[PDB]
Design an enzyme around this catalytic site. Structure first.
Site, PDB file in Angstrom:
ATOM      1  N   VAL A 291      29.040 -31.753  12.326  1.00 52.42           N
ATOM      2  CA  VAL A 291      27.721 -32.107  11.817  1.00 52.42           C
ATOM      3  C   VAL A 291      26.761 -32.499  12.937  1.00 52.42           C
ATOM      4  CG1 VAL A 291      28.334 -34.519  11.381  1.00 52.42           C
ATOM      5  CG2 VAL A 291      26.461 -33.449  10.101  1.00 52.42           C
ATOM      6  N   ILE A 294      24.928 -29.302  14.499  1.00 53.23           N
ATOM      7  CA  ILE A 294      24.169 -28.506  13.547  1.00 53.23           C
ATOM      8  C   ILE A 294      22.792 -29.138  13.382  1.00 53.23           C
ATOM      9  CG2 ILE A 294      23.915 -27.852  11.135  1.00 53.23           C
ATOM     10  CD1 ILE A 294      25.789 -26.058  12.552  1.00 53.23           C
ATOM     11  N   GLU A 296      20.335 -29.883  11.272  1.00 53.00           N
ATOM     12  CA  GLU A 296      20.026 -29.826   9.847  1.00 53.00           C
ATOM     13  C   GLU A 296      18.525 -29.809   9.589  1.00 53.00           C
ATOM     14  OE1 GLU A 296      22.183 -32.452  10.903  1.00 53.00           O
ATOM     15  OE2 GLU A 296      24.009 -31.288  10.557  1.00 53.00           O
ATOM     16  N   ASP A 338      -5.002   3.561   8.905  1.00 53.31           N
ATOM     17  CA  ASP A 338      -5.395   4.660   8.037  1.00 53.31           C
ATOM     18  C   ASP A 338      -6.906   4.828   8.117  1.00 53.31           C
ATOM     19  OD1 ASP A 338      -5.069   6.666   5.885  1.00 53.31           O
ATOM     20  OD2 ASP A 338      -6.015   5.156   4.608  1.00 53.31           O
ATOM     21  N   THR A 340      -9.296   6.708   6.023  1.00 48.59           N
ATOM     22  CA  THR A 340     -10.089   6.593   4.806  1.00 48.59           C
ATOM     23  C   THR A 340      -9.650   5.370   4.011  1.00 48.59           C
ATOM     24  OG1 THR A 340     -10.054   9.009   4.806  1.00 48.59           O
ATOM     25  CG2 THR A 340     -11.047   7.914   2.920  1.00 48.59           C
ATOM     26  N   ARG A 471     -22.411  28.766  -4.878  1.00 42.47           N
ATOM     27  CA  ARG A 471     -21.550  28.947  -3.714  1.00 42.47           C
ATOM     28  C   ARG A 471     -22.267  29.691  -2.592  1.00 42.47           C
ATOM     29  NH1 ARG A 471     -18.660  29.015  -8.373  1.00 42.47           N
ATOM     30  NH2 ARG A 471     -19.636  31.035  -8.853  1.00 42.47           N
ATOM     31  N   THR A 603      -3.732   9.477   9.507  1.00 40.91           N
ATOM     32  CA  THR A 603      -4.474   9.783   8.293  1.00 40.91           C
ATOM     33  C   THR A 603      -4.160  11.198   7.832  1.00 40.91           C
ATOM     34  OG1 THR A 603      -6.656   9.849   7.256  1.00 40.91           O
ATOM     35  CG2 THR A 603      -6.479  10.639   9.520  1.00 40.91           C
ATOM     36  N   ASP A 681      -4.522   1.461   2.475  1.00 38.86           N
ATOM     37  CA  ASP A 681      -4.987   1.125   1.134  1.00 38.86           C
ATOM     38  C   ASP A 681      -4.585   2.115   0.053  1.00 38.86           C
ATOM     39  OD1 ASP A 681      -6.716   3.272   1.803  1.00 38.86           O
ATOM     40  OD2 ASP A 681      -8.274   2.464   0.485  1.00 38.86           O
ATOM     41  N   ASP A 685       0.061   5.497   2.050  1.00 37.94           N
ATOM     42  CA  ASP A 685       0.582   4.589   3.062  1.00 37.94           C
ATOM     43  C   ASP A 685       1.780   3.793   2.571  1.00 37.94           C
ATOM     44  OD1 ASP A 685      -1.780   5.335   4.559  1.00 37.94           O
ATOM     45  OD2 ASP A 685      -2.864   3.867   3.340  1.00 37.94           O
ATOM     46  N   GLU A 749      24.050 -35.604  21.314  1.00 42.66           N
ATOM     47  CA  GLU A 749      24.920 -36.258  20.338  1.00 42.66           C
ATOM     48  C   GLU A 749      26.347 -35.720  20.412  1.00 42.66           C
ATOM     49  OE1 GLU A 749      22.773 -35.237  16.891  1.00 42.66           O
ATOM     50  OE2 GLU A 749      21.246 -36.798  17.121  1.00 42.66           O
ATOM     51  N   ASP A 778      14.459 -36.597  14.038  1.00 42.65           N
ATOM     52  CA  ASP A 778      14.333 -35.344  14.771  1.00 42.65           C
ATOM     53  C   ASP A 778      13.371 -34.381  14.081  1.00 42.65           C
ATOM     54  OD1 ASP A 778      15.828 -36.026  16.928  1.00 42.65           O
ATOM     55  OD2 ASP A 778      17.398 -34.523  16.627  1.00 42.65           O
TER      56      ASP A 778
HETATM   57  F1  BEF Z   1      -6.362   8.635   5.403  1.00 36.64           F
HETATM   58 BE1  BEF Z   1      -5.262   7.662   4.922  1.00 36.64          BE
HETATM   59  F2  BEF Z   1      -3.955   8.434   4.713  1.00 36.64           F
HETATM   60  F3  BEF Z   1      -5.775   7.013   3.598  1.00 36.64           F
HETATM   61 MG   LIG Z   2      -6.628   5.193   2.626  1.00 38.75          MG
END
Ligand code: BEF
Ligand SMILES: [Mg+2]
Length: 987
Positions: A291, A294, A296, A338, A340, A471, A603, A681, A685, A749, A778
């Protein structure tokens, strides 16, 4: 149904047996719901409280103290208190820990959405569409999607009702721009989520489109479900702090076993035939040693310092979901990120816009990086009153009128949210920032200021109709007539080179002049420069019609009429917008590079925008080459092993990667033996936030990324990361200081016990006394040292080594030597009461060891019963307490001695020392406490002798610091204050 992006519409209709026009019967949906299941993900997959204590009680030293305590219960056949008190600590330092893991969770679901998303499904029971829940959707349902709707499950598009469909997959693939879809199938069977342009995914909301599709996956088979599966499959190891603590505990168990077997070998040479009557003293000394060796109070003080660090971090809006994760950001060397949502605000916004002033361009720059209409306009400086420029008024009109999105304040969230397309929302927030009519923006509320300027500009102009963005023409138009009047205008916004080629006039202010080639080449060059350099933007040419065709002959049925009627246009200006980085990253990346922590940005977007934002935030330069510092998913996959290694060691911007690719990069970085810290986010991820050591998430991120992380930046601030780095470094410094202090005390001790056992003297320190010392006397100084002042340049040196020990080599000698002295002193105290005690029995020097037998008087020494008097134990306890007070007083700095730093510089330390001394005096003079163990109040001369014995420890440790540091002074207040205290005891 594995994948539907390769099969046509009729193929999946025949595979599901569902007709698009009618829908599904009740038997079909019932069988599909019973076969596939509900459309919902499990909840946190966690454990209750009944198992956390069993998980936390699996260490080694806890088992050693449990064995010692059980041996004590066995030999404790007169109430015994020694093994009980420590058990209470095992409940105090554990439950509090649990109290954290729950409390942090209570701070995560508070910022979560509370609205259950619905879904529009066509079923055979009704003729129209049905708004049902998001869980009762089964593969085969005809789901209809509109503007702003969040897609409830993986859907293969069947019929696009509108002319186009824009989906915002920034939650899943990190694409910053709204992706355009098409019903045609992609023949690629193994295509990535960014290539399936006929499918939809859960969570991703429709930007500006509307269509009808069939469900393909649901529940777990969806993309978010596969991500959650890959996330929960990955494992999370222990933090480096816990690893160091476990290695230290293993070393402590080793040294305990060594000293115990040494005591056993020394003791067996005397007693034979293991008698069992005398073996009780062997077990008593063994449990006392076990003891004493250790700490504690060490787990309790570590939990206290970690909880204080968490309380300090929570002021920076960083909900930490565990105790030992505050130090993990101290030793981190790499910080993945990341693009975005984390680095960029994920909210498209305008930065600059140029008009022409050819009697020469006038280029304004807009400040702001979000959807909040509180920005300002800047030409060069001195924010210009935009009401003067008539051409800018025409630009505001031509842009605000041709819109379909808007902004609105969400009181449940507290942030301006977009409704509709992201780029048109950036344009309308441009309009709100730049008011050409000088309207008031102070008294009105926020929910109305979100569209005040646009509503004012829409009063005098009544939009007749709209020619939608095609387009080939790649530009959208609006026909409108001015209210309260020949008076008719047709506005057009589109691609730069798709409008100037049809622009046959030029609007200089209010003057319409014919088209000349010089200004055309000039504007084309400036636009090509705006969106191709280190500041790539999204350009939008604006042109209005001087003589728009009448409505009676204007046909809106053929596609070619959208271009034939769009001729003879005059240019008004151009707009430049991008996904802007947060205003608190450009400097935080520099402050984090100063600390020797590299910043990588991984990303899923394309390499162009990725490298652009990476240059903009400060990882690169406007002219720095990126040939070996910008990799793509295919590029990284097509490299040899050494190439991948040098890439993940040198690269700083990864684009177009999958969640599994992010996990691969993070595990490579960790294989390089360096702590990583990934932020993010999205739902891409999450597989790489658990793989990282300290996974950080954003407050506005997705629930999966916040549940697969160890921290949540609620304020989305990025400087909180460097603040946490500094705090973790300070926490680790204080921790390695007070752990060394506690271990020095424990070794003192233990050597005291070993000396009093081998020499043969009676007991000088019983376990319960060691319990009380190591706990209170202590823990108070250790908790005080946990508040050490931070170093003046703690954030100016490279990160700590991952293999450095808590107990340094040479230092292990230092805190040993002094420690040994402590032991001696304690023993000396006992020996004092047996040698030079004026009121104590002066037992013979050669007959004091033989105390177990002394009972008949066979020599001059008599009274063989005082050897259990409380006075020698009190001497030993008091000298140990004051020597530990002195040790904690001088252990204020690592190397610089007290002669370079006063002890009262840390007021908490001296306060705790005085409190511990007054508590030690409180355990002598009080009535009931000196009865638990064997102590007794001391005399004045006895206390002075204890102080004289224990004070040279400070001189020893000072001179040892001196000889360790060497290979004017501030001693004047020292020789002013401590001189009477030292000269008064030797006279
Ligand atoms: F661009 Be990260 F993968 F949101
Ligand atoms: Mg993101």
């Amino acid at each position: 149904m594995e994948n539907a992006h390769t099969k046509t519409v009729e193929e999946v209709l025949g595979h599901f047996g569902v007709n698009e026009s009618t829908g599904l019967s009740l038997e079909q949906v019932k069988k599909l719901k019973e076969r596939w299941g509900s459309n919902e993900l499990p909840a946190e997959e966690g454990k209750t409280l009944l198992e956390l204590v069993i998980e936390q009680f699996e260490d080694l030293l806890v088992r050693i103290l449990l064995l010692a305590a059980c041996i004590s219960f066995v030999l404790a056949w007169t109430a015994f208190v020694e093994p009980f008190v420590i058990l209470l600590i095992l409940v105090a330092n554990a439950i509090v820990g649990v109290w954290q893991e729950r409390n942090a969770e209570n701070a995560i679901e508070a910022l979560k959405e509370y609205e259950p998303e619905m879904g529009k499904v066509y079923r055979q029971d009704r003729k129209s569409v049905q708004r049902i829940k998001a869980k009762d959707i089964v593969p085969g349902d005809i789901v209809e999607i509109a503007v702003g709707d969040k897609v409830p499950a993986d859907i293969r598009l069947t019929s696009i009702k509108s002319t186009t469909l824009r989906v915002d997959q920034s939650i899943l693939t990190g694409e910053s721009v709204s992706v355009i879809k098409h019903t045609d199938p992609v023949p690629d069977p193994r295509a990535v989520n960014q290539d399936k342009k006929n499918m939809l995914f859960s969570g991703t909301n429709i930007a500006a489109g509307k269509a009808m599709g069939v469900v393909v996956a649901t529940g777990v088979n969806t993309e978010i479900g596969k991500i959650r599966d890959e996330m929960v499959a990955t494992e999370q190891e222990r933090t480096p702090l816990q690893q160091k603590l476990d290695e230290f505990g293993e070393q402590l168990s080793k040294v305990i076993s060594l000293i115990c077997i040494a005591v056993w070998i020394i003791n067996i040479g005397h007693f034979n035939d293991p008698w069992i009557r005398g073996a009780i003293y062997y077990f008593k000394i063994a449990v006392a040693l076990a003891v004493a060796a250790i700490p504690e109070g060490l787990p309790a003080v570590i939990t206290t310092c970690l909880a204080l660090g968490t309380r300090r971090m929570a002021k920076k809006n960083a909900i930490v979901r565990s105790l030992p994760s505050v130090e993990t950001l101290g030793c981190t060397s790499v910080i993945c990120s990341d693009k975005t949502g984390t680095l960029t605000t994920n909210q498209m916004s305008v930065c600059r816009m140029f008009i022409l002033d050819r009697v020469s361009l006038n280029e304004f720059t807009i400040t702001g990086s979000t959807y909040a209409p509180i920005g300002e306009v800047h030409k060069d400086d001195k924010p210009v009153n935009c009401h003067q420029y008539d051409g800018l008024v025409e630009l505001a009109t031509i842009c605000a009128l041709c819109n379909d999105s808007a902004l609105d304040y969400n009181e449940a969230k507290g942030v301006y949210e977009k409704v509709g397309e992201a780029t048109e929302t950036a344009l309308t927030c441009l309009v709100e920032k730049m008011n050409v009519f000088d309207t008031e923006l102070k008294g009105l509320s926020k929910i109305e200021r979100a569209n005040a300027c646009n509503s004012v500009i829409k009063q005098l102009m009544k939009k007749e109709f709209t020619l939608e963005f095609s387009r080939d023409r790649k530009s959208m138009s609006v026909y409108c007539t001015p209210n309260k009047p020949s008076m008719s205008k047709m506005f057009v916004k589109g691609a730069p080179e798709g409008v100037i080629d049809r622009c046959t006039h030029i609007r200089v202010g209010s003057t319409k002049v014919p088209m000349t080639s010089g200004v055309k080449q000039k504007i084309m060059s400036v636009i090509r420069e705006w969106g191709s350099g280190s500041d790539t933007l999204r350009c939008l040419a604006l042109a209005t019609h001087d003589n728009p065709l009448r409505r009676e002959e204007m046909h809106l049925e053929d596609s070619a009429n959208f271009i034939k009627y769009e001729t003879n246009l005059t240019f008004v200006g151009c707009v430049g917008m991008l996904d802007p980085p947060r205003i608190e990253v450009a400097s935080s990346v520099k402050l984090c590079r100063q600390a020797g922590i590299r910043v990588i940005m991984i990303t899923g977007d394309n390499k162009g925008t990725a490298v652009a934002i990476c240059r903009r935030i400060g990882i690169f330069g406007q002219d720095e080459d990126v040939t070996s510092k910008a990799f793509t998913g295919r590029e990284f996959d097509e490299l040899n092993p050494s190439a991948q290694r040098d890439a993940c060691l040198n690269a700083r911007c990864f684009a177009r990667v999958e969640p599994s690719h992010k996990s691969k990069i993070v595990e490579f970085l960790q294989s390089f033996d360096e702590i990583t810290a990934m932020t993010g986010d999205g739902v891409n991820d999450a597989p790489a936030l658990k793989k990282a050591e300290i996974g950080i998430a954003m407050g506005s991120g997705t629930a999966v990324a916040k549940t697969a992380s160890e921290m949540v930046l609620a304020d989305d601030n990025f400087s909180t990361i460097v603040a946490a780095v500094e705090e973790g470094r300070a926490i680790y410094n204080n921790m390695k200081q007070f752990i060394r202090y506690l271990i020095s005390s424990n070794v003192g001790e233990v050597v005291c016990i070993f000396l009093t056992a081998a020499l043969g003297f009676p007991e000088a320190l019983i376990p319960v006394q060691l319990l009380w010392v190591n706990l209170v006397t202590d823990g108070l100084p250790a908790t005080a040292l946990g508040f050490n002042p931070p170093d003046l340049d703690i954030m100016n040196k490279p990160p700590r080594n991952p293999k450095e020990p808590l107990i340094s080599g040479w230092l292990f000698f230092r805190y040993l030597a002094i420690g040994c002295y402590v032991g001696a002193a304690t023993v000396g105290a006992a020996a004092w009461w047996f040698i030079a005690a004026d009121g104590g029995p002066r037992v013979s020097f050669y007959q004091l060891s033989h105390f177990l037998q002394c009972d008949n008087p066979d020599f001059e020494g008599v009274d063989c019963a005082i050897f259990e008097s409380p006075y020698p134990m009190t001497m030993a306890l008091s000298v140990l307490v004051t020597i530990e007070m002195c040790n904690a007083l001088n252990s204020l700095s690592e190397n610089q001695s007290l002669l370079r730093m006063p002890p009262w510089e840390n007021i908490w330390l001296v306060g705790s020392i005085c409190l511990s001394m007054s508590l030690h005096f409180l355990i002598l003079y009080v009535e009931p406490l000196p009865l638990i163990f064997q102590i007794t109040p001391l005399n004045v001369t006895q206390w002075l002798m204890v102080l004289k014995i224990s004070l040279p420890v400070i001189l020893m440790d000072e001179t040892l610091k001196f000889v360790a540091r060497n290979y004017d002074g501030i001693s004047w207040p020292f020789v002013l204050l401590i001189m009477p205290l030292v000269i008064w005891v030797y006279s």
